RNA sequence: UUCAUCUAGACAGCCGGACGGUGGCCAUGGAAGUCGGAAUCCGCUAAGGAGUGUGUAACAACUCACCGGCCGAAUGAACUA
RNA sequence: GCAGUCAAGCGUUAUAGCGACAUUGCUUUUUGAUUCGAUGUCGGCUCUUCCUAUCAUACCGAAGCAGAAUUCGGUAA
């Protein structure tokens, strides 16, 4: 509104490689170069306890669980890919790591949480892996048609999954 | 003969009876040979030999470092 | 110029200095205060699993190895240099590969354990041959007739230069198998073995000798005396 | 790709299955046979057959290279 | 004797160097 | 008769795991099918886990047992879902194990260990866990080792 | 068809090739030029240096390019075998790198001879000649990796067996340890190794024999595992391509004693799985090791 | 056994005079470059000298004496 | 010339030790320190690499990194002229 | 060649400046496809000898050198 800084988030020790606002708008997740993920309350500009540790290389992408799949009274979980070839799922209410998908042999370029309980991961191993969260995070599909790194992937419902329950009116 | 026939022949018949000792004595003689080459090669061959020796010494120092 | 050039290796383990000897010195001198009986053990040509089994059996005691000169300096070499009274006799009784067993256990228990402890060991050089060994005619196997050749595995072809040159056993390679034209006598029972024969027995894996920990003497803290035990000292 | 330090143990683009693989091999064999017939109607009937007889074509005359001078 | 003198010279050199 | 011992490494739960045992089974006259069946029966607890199988041979028999190992016990404690080689490759063993489970593995491995203390056996198990890459008490296994060195962690059986 | 490619000249690495060609120039061309000579003589001296060095590099590259087989023009069996062994993409890319280097070296030689036509002093002519030779050296040193790859490929491809795909062939296939190399040893004088462990044989082996005054070849293959082609490896792909391409009589070997480490059910399943491979070829199932167990006293 | 031509060591007058001129030019150029260029510009007691301790004691004593001699 | 090592033993040499979790994890038809990719930790030590090389289809075996016994007095490295 | 990078050294007590060996970018990008201004001296014949910086012949060394053939190199005119 005023084009002025409001808060500073100073928990990490290395470059903040990715940021992501929750689809419910309640928390900002920052994945950094120091192989950590932090969560921040935006209104207070504060850090929600400690960092999410466990990755051995830097964070490459953060994706949120859709609100329309999260049951009411619950907070969406955070999927995170990294250079070490793993996709880690974080339950933020308990601040724990539940699932660790590991099928990729090279750095994961991006991870996306779709609207049907699926996770799509693109990695430098020239493959796209489709995991099912309803089947304990098992890799349901391996899609191999590219001859090089898959740099990025996008879903048809990406805008809706990012926006959650809000609209252009902001209600 | 087909595929790795020399390797299979070494596996089946061995080598010459004096092979290991001959190789060992050649490797022992290599130091004297290097010094004789450095003091005996003349002209372009001597210059190239000295240049290669300097490059090898630099590479070995880098590997130790 | 004209000097030998040292071979250069790129490995992880670096040499130990005088600090390690000082640490061993201090450990021995502190165990001298801490424990009651110090036993001098002869453990020449001991294998590390055997030594570690001895250490495991003697839980609560302290076994210290090291250079014999370091151990004798820790105990005190002469009468004016002894760390405790009548310890120079124990210090001068140390010979060869010497270990120190500091303990508070009973003299009878130590004697019984070191009389009843024995393990199968390789036949070392300059010892007595425990058996007569003969490599049979034909294809040479890994055990060399110590087990039936139907169950045994043929000797690998890569060992034939070692057997022919280092072991001086007349061998041939036939279709990738080591062969001898005649049966070969390696050792005779009750005969002194040399480095070559001991190496042949070790290569075939025959271990019929016995390892026994020799005990020379011990020192008591309160009595300040040294008594010769003479265990396995025939 | 190849050599003492090679780490390629599987084909990069594996075929779908054995039926598609044998269909591809039959197609390749047929194309090779047709190509061999088409090229051997001319070349093996011409130049290569002369190599058995030890014959060589007459050397090209310099008068046909006039106009191509530096 | 001779080794004692060599050791003594070693000690003197070390003390001079540290001073 | 005589007791002949053979050892192998095999993924647990798979019948016909004695493909590499044919050069060893050959002179004895054992049945490869029976050996594989017995190995699969003995490896029921460990499914999809590379474990150490010991075979005892007396007269004309073949009995299979599992020799406990630090890596196999850590992977079993990791509680990973069962996997097939066709489905899942390049698995990262990055679960969480608790201090009590580590101490239990140390108790299982204490019988054949030279570690003079249960703390030493636990530290060996934690080094194996660091090798497999898992997590202990949501910490690094070497961090737990350093904590045991400092004295914050108490070993129960002294 | 050629069936053999042992007559490929040695491929020097980049630095060795540079040494060879540059020292050939320094030895085989005159080296003494004086600044007091005529400028035409000086220019001819350096032009000869540049042209001779370019010709040496082009001769070496042409020897490389003529020696190696054209992988897309050989028989499809040889094409598939060489693709499995050497990765056809890398093979063709390396040979194209050699061709591009040859063209660039020719361009450098022509350009700098044309430039040397206008040299005014010995210093300028020497600088131009050194520039031409240095650019040639840069082009050649860019080829360090394809030359190593091609030397390894040349050594490996000189030792491949000569398989005629249009002669009479007995193909031998099955699981590992079923007796394929033993049968080839029995029927031919090939020296294929016979050992009681899987995948002793990792490549195709050829033997020959005579039947009714007719020369027959026999191909012994590495064993195939009952897996799809998606997870099949190159060693098994050799056997797969052999069975797919060579029109022949296939002998599928079965060990009913299960000494090979594979069950009879697994062997039957493998046979039914590779059933589409041998269509419109002669097929026979040979049960080996009848001195241990027999089909008649089975279950 | 075919002996080659040996290089002559008889001095050429023209070569010697040319070397003189070349050396004078080199000296002038080195002096000029030393004046023009920019470049930023005690071994102690040898370890084998026997009375190192005596020399060190003497220099320390002189330093300590001169500490108070110049002050007062 | 400067650094180091040395009679609680210098440099060479011979002999012996060179261990245990453990065939660490992934990958591989097979890969046990030694085709590869990432960890490279703990114990027991006098010392011993999750290995310096040879070697095996994998093991085995030998080696050397380090340690010890015998020997008994000076030695090694890097620079300068 | 130009423009950089690294640093065994050199220099210094102002972590300036020189800098060997290596190395990157441009010229030159992937499937072995498909002639451009010599401004002043040149060629032959016969016949001799010299150099080696060796094409062949002699003897050697190395190389996936099985044999055959070939490549690289040494002494050698
Ligand atoms: N008893 C018996 N053993 C056989 C027979 N054929 C082969 N073998 C054994 O099977 C082992 C492996 O055979 P091999 O030739 O390597 O079969 P491959 O691996 O399929 O080529 C060898 O050690 C042979 O001794 C047979 O007819 N009878
Ligand atoms: Mg075979
Ligand atoms: Mg010459």
SS3 for H14-38 is HHHHHHHHHHHHHHHHHHHHHHHCC
Q: Cα(C94)–Cα(C90) distance, rounded to whole angstroms?
A: 7
Secondary structure element (H or E) that encloses residue C194, with its range: none
The percent of chain C in helix, strand and coil, each rounded to the nearest 5, is 30, 25, 45
CA F18 to chain centre: 18
Q: Dig out the tokens for D5 from the structure.
A: 């330090």
Task: Lay out the sheet containing A78-82: strands in order across.
Answer: A59-64, A78-82, A87-91, A96-101
- Cα H37–Cα H38–Cα H40 angle in degrees, nearest 5: 135
Q: Which atom of ligand 1 is nearest to the CA of G200?
A: 19
Report the C-alpha gap between G241 and C188 in whole angstroms: 60
What does the block give as tokens for A81? 């890919």
Q: Do the beta carbons of residue F122 and residue F155 sit within 8 Å?
A: yes
DSSP for residue A37? E
Q: Find and list the nucleotides of strand I having atoms within 7 Å of a protein beta carbon.
A: 1-9, 12, 14-31, 35-36, 39-52, 55-62, 64-70, 73, 76-77
Q: How far is the CA of G185 from the centre of ligand 1 (A)?
A: 11
C187: helix, strand or coil:
strand
d(CA A132, CA A130): 7
Residue A153 contacts residue A120 (beta carbons within 8 Å): yes
**What is the C-alpha to C-alpha distance for residues G178 and G183, in angstroms, rounded to an integer?**
10
H9 exposed, middle or buried (CB, 10 Å; 0-12, 13-18, 19+)? exposed
Task: Judge whether H49 and H55 are in contact, CB under 8 Å.
Answer: yes
Q: Which nucleotide is nearest to G40 (CA to C1')?
A: J38
Q: C146, C172, C144, C142: which is closest to C160 by C-alpha?
A: C172
Q: Give residues 190 to 229 of G whose Cβ lies within 8 Å of B.
A: 190-191, 193, 203, 205-206
Longest dimension (CA), chain E: 27
* Span from the CA of G182 to the centroid of ligand 1 (angstroms): 6
Dist CA A113 CA A137 (whole Å): 12
Find residue A32's DSSP bridge partners.
Answer: A16
First to last CA, chain H: 88
Nearest to F5 by CA among F58, F69, F42: F58
Strands A52-53 and A36-41, sheet pairing: antiparallel
Chain C 154-193, CB < 7 Å to strand I: 156-159, 162
The distance in angstroms from the start CA to the end CA of chain E is 27
Q: F116 CA to chain C: closest CA distance, Å? A: 7
Which residues does F12 contact at the CB level (< 8 Å), separation at least 6?
A: F43, F44, F45, F46, F47, F48, F49, F50, F51, F66
Chains interfacing with A (3 or more CB pairs < 8 Å):
F
Task: List residues bridging with G209 in a β-sheet.
Answer: G216
φ and ψ at residue G217, rounded to 5 degrees: -105, 155
Q: How far, in Å, CA of A140 to CA of A142, rounded? A: 7
Residue nearest J36, CA–C1′ metric: G114
Using an 8 Å Cβ cutoff, are G169 and G245 in contact? no
CB pairs under 8 A between B and C: 20
CA F137 to chain centre: 21
Of C85, C80, C117, nearest to C101 by C-alpha is C117
> Is the separation of the CB atoms in G206 and G57 below 8 Å?
no
Q: A43 vs chain F: nearest CA distance in angstroms?
A: 30
- Give distance CA C20 / C1' I64 (Å): 22
Residues 6+ apart with CB under 8 A from H36: none
Which nucleotide is nearest to C176 if distance is taken from CA to C1'?
I56
| Residues in contact with ligand 1 (CB, 6 Å cut-off) | G 176-182, 194-196, 200-201, 223, 288-289, 291-292
Cβ(C99)–Cβ(C41) under 8 Å?
A: yes
Distance from CA of F141 to the nearest CA of G (A): 36
Compare all CA atoms of chain H with the CA of E9 and give the residue at the minimum distance. H50
Question: Residue A12 half-sphere exposure, CB side, CA atoms within 13 Å?
Answer: 23
Tell me how many helices (H) and strands (E) chain G has.
Answer: 9, 5
Rounded CA–C1' distance between C10 and I12, in angstroms: 21
* F92-96 long-range contacts, CB within 8 A, separation 24+: F92/A85, F92/A86, F92/A100, F92/A102, F92/F133, F93/F132, F93/F133, F93/F134, F94/A54, F94/A86, F94/A100, F94/A102, F94/F133, F94/F134, F94/F135, F95/A100, F95/F134, F95/F135, F96/F134, F96/F135, F96/F136, F96/F137, F96/F138
CA–CA gap between residue A102 and residue A87 (Å, rounded): 7
Q: How far apart are CA F61 and CA F141, in angstroms?
A: 43
> CA of C130 and C1' of I38: distance in angstroms?
50
- Sole residue written with tokens 């016979």: G194
By the CB < 8 Å criterion, does B21 face chain C? Answer: yes
Instruction: Decide if F119 contacts F152 (C-beta within 8 A).
Output: no
Strand, coil or helix: C108: helix
H-helix or E-strand containing C135?
A: strand C133-135
Q: Separation of CA C56 and C1' I22 in angstroms?
A: 20
Q: Is G161 on the interface with B (CB under 8 A)?
A: yes
Q: Are strands A118-123 and A128-132 parallel, antiparallel or unpaired?
A: antiparallel
Contact G232 D2 (CB under 8 A): no
Q: Which of B12, B20, B63 sits opposite C161 (nearest CB)?
A: B20
In chain G, the DSSP E strands lie at 168-174, 205-211, 214-220, 249-255, 282-288
CB C193 within 8 A of CB C127: yes
Nearest of D18, D28, D11 to residue G89 by alpha carbon:
D11
Name, in order, each residue with C-beta under 8 angstroms of A136's C-beta and a sequence gap of 6 or more: A99, F81
Query: d(Cα F66, Cα A166) in Å, to the nearest integer?
Result: 58
Token pair for residue G45? 């001296």
Which of G223, G201, G204 lies closest to G267, judged by CA?
G223
User: How many other C-beta atoms lie within 10 A of the C-beta of residue F18?
Assistant: 29
Note the maximum CA span of chain B.
47
**Are C106 and C61 contacting, i.e. CB atoms less than 8 angstroms apart?**
no
* Strand-pair partners of F11: F50
Q: How far apart are CA G225 and CA G233, in angstroms?
A: 10
Instruction: Please judge whether B63 and C176 are an interchain contact, meaning their C-beta atoms are less than 8 angstroms apart.
Output: no
Q: Is beta strand A78-82 parallel, antiparallel or unpaired with respect to A59-64?
A: antiparallel
CA angle H40, H42, H48 (to 5 degrees): 140
Strands C172-174 and C177-180: antiparallel
Closest CA to A110 of A68, A77, A148, A79: A79
Rounded to an integer, what distance in angstroms lies between the CA atom of residue B41 and that of residue C172?
Answer: 44
DSSP code, position F47: S
| Nearest alpha carbon to residue C41 among C1, C95, C89 | C95
Compute the Cα dihedral for C117, C119, C125, C130 and give only its sign: positive
Q: What are phi and psi of A96, to 5 degrees?
A: -120, 165
DSSP H or E segment with residue A30: strand A28-32
Strands C37-42 and A118-123: unpaired
Q: Half-sphere exposure (CA, 13 Å, Cβ side) for A72?
A: 1
Nearest protein residue by Cα to C1' of nucleotide I39: F131
- Starting from the CA of residue B43, give the closest ligand: 3
CA dist., res. A50 & res. F139, Å (int): 13
Chains F and C touch (3+ CB pairs under 8 A): yes
Length of chain C: 234
Tokens 């040479």: give the residue.
Answer: C140
* Determination technique for this entry: cryo-EM
How many degrees, rounded to 5, is the angle at CA G113 between CA G108 and CA G119?
125
- C-alpha pair distances (Å), C13 with each of C8, C10, C16, C20, G255: 14, 9, 9, 14, 52
| Contact: B4, G205; criterion CB under 8 Å | no
Give the residue with minimal CA–C1' separation from I70: C96
* Rounded Cα gap, residues B15 and G219, in angstroms: 30
Q: A157 burial class (0-12, 13-18, 19+ CB within 10 angstroms)?
A: middle
Residue F88 structure tokens: 């899942």
Take residue A44 and report the two structure tokens written for it: 């207070």
SS (H, E, C) A81-109: EECCCCEEEEECCCCEEEEEECCCCCCEE
Work out the angle at residue A28's Cα, subtended by the Cα atoms of residues A26 and A34, and round it to the nearest 5 degrees.
155
Type and span of the H or E element at A29: strand A28-32
Q: Is the dihedral of CA G165, G95, G229, F84 positive or negative?
A: positive
**DSSP 3-state assignment of D17?**
coil
Find the length of chain G. Answer: 299
CA of G154, C1' of J71: distance in angstroms? 13
CA distance D21 to G228: 11
Q: Name the E strands within F29-153.
A: 50-58, 63-67, 96-97, 135-136
Contact G188, F15 (CB under 8 A): no
What SS3 class is residue D57? coil
Contacts with E18 from chain H: Cβ below 8 Å: none
Q: What is the enclosing helix (H) or strand (E) of A129?
A: strand A128-132
Q: Which strand ranges, in their side-by-side order, compose the sheet holding C138-139? A: C138-139, C177-180, C172-174
| Residue whose CA is at the smallest distance from ligand 1 atom 7 | G179
Report the distance separating Cα G154 and Cα H58, nearest Å. Answer: 79
Whole-angstrom distance, CA of residue C197 vs CA of residue C214: 25
Task: Out of G174, G181, G182, give the residue to mutate to test ligand 1, the one with the largest number of ligand atoms within 8 Å of its CB.
Answer: G182
Which bases along strand J come within 7 Å of a protein CB atom? 1, 8, 11-12, 14, 16-17, 20-22, 26-39, 41-42, 51-55, 63-68, 70-74, 76-77
Q: Inspect the interface and report whether the beta carbons of F26 and G258 lie closer than 8 Å.
A: no
How many whole angstroms separate alpha carbon G92 and alpha carbon G157? 15
- What is the per-residue burial (b if ≥16 Cβ within 10 Å, else e) of G7-38? ebeebbebeebbeebbebbeeeeeeebeeeee
Helix axis angle, G88-116 to G144-157, nearest 10°: 130
Cα–Cα distances (Å) from B46 to B27, B38, B40, G19, G21, in that order, read 22, 7, 8, 15, 19
CA D23, D29, D32, D33 torsion: positive or negative? negative
Look up tokens 């998908």; give the residue: A101
Element spanning C229, H or E:
strand C226-231
- CB of G39 within 8 A of CB of G120? yes
Q: How far is G191 from chain F (nearest CA, A)?
A: 22
- Distance in Å, CA G177 to ligand 2 centroid: 7
Q: Is residue A19 helix, strand or coil?
A: strand
Residue closest to G165 by CA, chosen among G82, G244, G69, G84: G244
Q: Give dist(CA G121, CA C207) in Å, integer.
A: 86
Backbone angles phi, psi at B63, to 5 degrees: -65, -40
Structural tokens at position H20: 């003189």
∠ Cα G183 G287 F18 (to 5°): 90
Core vs surface per residue F107-141: b (16+ CB within 10 A) or e: eebbeeeebeebbbbbbbbbebbbebebbbbebeb
User: Would you say G267 and D56 are in contact if contact means Cβ atoms under 8 Å apart?
Assistant: no
Instruction: Report which of G187, G183, G206 is spatially closest to residue G255, judged by C-alpha positions.
Output: G183
Residue G168: Cβ-neighbour burial (10 angstroms; 0-12, 13-18, 19+): middle
Angle at G112 between CA G108 and CA G118, to 5 degrees: 165
């Amino acid at each position: 509104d005023t084009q002025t800084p409001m808060h500073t988030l100073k928990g990490h020790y290395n470059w903040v490689l990715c940021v992501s606002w929750s689809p419910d708008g309640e928390v900002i997740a920052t994945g950094s170069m120091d192989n950590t993920i932090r969560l921040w309350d935006p209104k207070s500009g504060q850090c929600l306890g400690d960092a999410l540790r466990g990755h051995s290389k830097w964070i490459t992408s953060l994706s949120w669980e859709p609100i329309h799949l999260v049951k009411p009274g619950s907070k969406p979980r955070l999927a995170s890919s990294s250079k070490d070839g793993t996709i880690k799922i974080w339950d933020t209410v308990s601040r724990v790591c539940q699932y660790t998908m590991s099928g990729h042999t090279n750095s994961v370029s991006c991870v996306k949480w779709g609207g049907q309980g699926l996770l799509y991961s693109g990695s430098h191993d020239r493959t796209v892996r489709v995991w099912d969260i309803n089947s304990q995070g098992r890799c349901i599909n391996i899609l191999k048609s590219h001859a090089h790194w898959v740099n990025h992937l996008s879903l048809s419902t990406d805008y809706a999954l990012r926006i959650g329950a809000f609209d252009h009116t902001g209600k | 003969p087909q595929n790795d026939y020399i390797e299979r022949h070494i596996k089946q018949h061995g080598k010459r009876l004096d092979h290991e000792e001959r190789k060992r004595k050649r490797e022992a003689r290599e130091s004297h040979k290097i010094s004789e080459r450095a003091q005996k090669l003349t002209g372009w061959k001597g210059k190239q030999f000295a240049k290669k020796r300097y490059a090898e010494k630099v590479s070995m120092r880098k590997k130790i470092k | 110029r004209s000097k030998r050039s040292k071979l250069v290796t790129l490995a992880q383990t670096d040499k130990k200095g005088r600090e390690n000897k000082e640490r061993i010195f201090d450990e021995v001198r502190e165990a001298l205060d801490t424990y009651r009986y110090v036993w001098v053990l002869h453990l020449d040509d001991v294998r590390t699993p055997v030594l570690q089994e001895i250490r495991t059996s003697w839980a609560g005691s302290k076994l210290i190895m090291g250079k014999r000169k370091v151990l004798q300096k820790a105990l005190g070499e002469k009468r004016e240099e002894e760390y405790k009274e009548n310890l120079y006799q124990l210090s001068k009784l140390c010979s060869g590969v010497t270990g120190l067993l500091f303990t508070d256990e009973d003299v009878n228990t130590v004697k019984e354990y070191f009389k009843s402890y024995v393990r199968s060991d390789y036949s070392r050089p300059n010892t007595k041959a425990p058996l007569t060994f003969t490599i049979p005619e034909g294809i040479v196997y890994s055990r060399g007739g110590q087990i039936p050749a139907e169950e045994d595995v043929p000797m690998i072809h890569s060992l034939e230069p070692t057997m022919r040159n280092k072991f001086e056993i007349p061998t041939k390679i036939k279709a990738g198998k080591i062969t001898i034209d005649s049966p070969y006598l390696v050792c005779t029972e009750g005969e002194k073995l040399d480095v070559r024969q001991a190496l042949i027995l070790k290569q075939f894996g025959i271990a019929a000798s016995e390892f026994k920990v020799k005990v020379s003497a011990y020192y008591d803290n309160d009595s300040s005396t040294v008594e010769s035990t003479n265990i396995n000292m025939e | 790709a190849f050599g003492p330090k090679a780490q390629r143990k599987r084909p990069r683009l594996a075929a779908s299955n054995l039926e598609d693989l044998v269909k591809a091999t039959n197609e390749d064999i047929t194309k090779y046979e047709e190509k061999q017939v088409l090229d051997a109607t001319l070349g093996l009937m011409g130049n290569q057959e002369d190599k058995e007889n030890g014959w060589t074509s007459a050397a090209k005359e310099a008068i046909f290279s006039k106009g191509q001078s530096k | 004797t001779s080794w004692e003198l060599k050791k003594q010279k070693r000690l003197e050199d070390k003390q001079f160097k540290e001073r | 008769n005589e007791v002949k011992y053979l050892y192998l490494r095999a993924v647990g739960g798979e019948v016909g795991a004695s493909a590499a045992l044919a050069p060893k089974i050959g002179p004895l006259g054992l049945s490869p099918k029976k050996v594989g069946e017995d190995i699969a029966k003995a490896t029921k607890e460990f499914k999809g886990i590379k474990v150490t199988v010991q075979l005892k041979i007396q007269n004309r028999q073949a009995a299979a047992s599992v020799v406990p190992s630090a890596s196999s016990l850590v992977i079993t404690a990791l509680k990973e879902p069962p996997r097939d080689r066709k489905k899942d490759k390049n698995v990262k063993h990055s679960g969480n194990i608790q201090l009590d489970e580590i101490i239990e593995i140390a108790r299982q491995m204490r019988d054949k260990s030279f570690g003079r203390t249960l703390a030493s056996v636990t530290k060996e198990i934690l080094g194996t866990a660091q090798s497999v890459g898992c997590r202990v008490d949501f910490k690094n296994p070497h961090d737990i080792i350093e904590g045991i060195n400092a004295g914050e962690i108490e070993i129960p059986e002294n | 068809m050629q069936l053999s490619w042992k007559d490929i000249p040695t491929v020097a690495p980049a630095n060795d090739l540079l040494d060879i060609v540059l020292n050939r120039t320094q030895r085989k061309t005159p080296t003494v030029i004086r600044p007091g000579f005529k400028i035409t003589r000086i220019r001819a001296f350096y032009m000869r240096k540049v042209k001779y060095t370019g010709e040496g590099f082009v001769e070496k590259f042409e020897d490389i390019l003529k020696g190696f087989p054209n992988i897309n023009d050989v028989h499809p069996f040889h094409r598939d075998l060489m693709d499995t062994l050497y990765e056809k993409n890398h093979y063709k890319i390396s040979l194209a790198a050699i061709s591009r280097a040859k063209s660039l070296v020719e361009q450098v030689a022509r350009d700098y001879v044309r430039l040397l036509k206008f040299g005014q002093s010995l210093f300028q002519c020497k600088q131009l000649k050194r520039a031409a030779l240095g650019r040639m050296a840069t082009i050649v040193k860019k080829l360090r990796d394809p030359l190593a790859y091609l030397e390894q490929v040349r050594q490996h491809i000189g030792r491949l067996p000569s398989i005629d795909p249009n002669t009479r062939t007995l193909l031998i296939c099955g699981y590992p340890n079923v007796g394929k190399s033993s049968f080839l040893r029995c029927i031919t004088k090939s020296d294929v190794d016979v050992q009681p462990y899987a995948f002793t044989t990792k490549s195709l082996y050829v033997g020959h024999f005579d039947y009714k005054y007719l020369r027959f070849q026999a191909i012994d293959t590495p064993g195939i595992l009952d897996r799809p082609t998606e997870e099949m490896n190159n060693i098994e792909m050799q056997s797969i391509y052999a069975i797919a391409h060579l029109r022949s009589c296939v002998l599928y070997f079965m060990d009913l004693s299960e000494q090979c480490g594979f069950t009879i059910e697994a062997q039957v399943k493998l046979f039914h799985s590779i059933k589409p491979l041998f269509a419109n070829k002669s097929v026979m199932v040979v049960i080996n090791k009848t001195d241990i167990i027999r089909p008649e006293d089975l279950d | 056994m075919r002996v080659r031509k040996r290089q002559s060591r008889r001095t050429s007058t023209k070569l010697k005079e040319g070397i003189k001129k070349k050396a004078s030019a080199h000296r002038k150029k080195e002096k000029k470059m030393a004046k023009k260029d920019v470049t930023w510009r005690d071994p102690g007691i040898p370890s084998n000298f026997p009375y190192k301790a005596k020399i060190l004691e003497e220099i320390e004593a002189k330093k300590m004496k001169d500490l108070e001699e110049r002050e007062l």
